[PDB]
Write a protein that binds this DNA or RNA. Structure first.
Ligand SMILES: O=C(O)c1cnc2ccccc2n1
Ligand SMILES: *C(=O)c1cnc2ccccc2n1
Lengths: 8, 10
DNA sequence: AGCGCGT
DNA sequence: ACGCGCT
């Protein structure tokens, strides 16, 4: 759930 | 949800 | 608490 | 450099 490179 | 962002639900 | 990811 | 999302 976090979006720092991919945001899933 | 999803997965991701299971379901809902299951 | 274990699912779903890649710049 | 990192956690989110309801039935
Ligand atoms: O794509 C993106 C991504 C890739 N790797 C990571 C590693 C740690 C924290 C955040 C990260 N974000
Ligand atoms: C988001 O909160 C989150 C947590 N863990 C993960 C593992 C693998 C891919 C994506 C993920 N996203």
């Amino acid at each position: 759930x976090a979006x720092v490179x991919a945001x899933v | 949800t999803x997965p991701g962002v299971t379901x809902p639900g299951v």
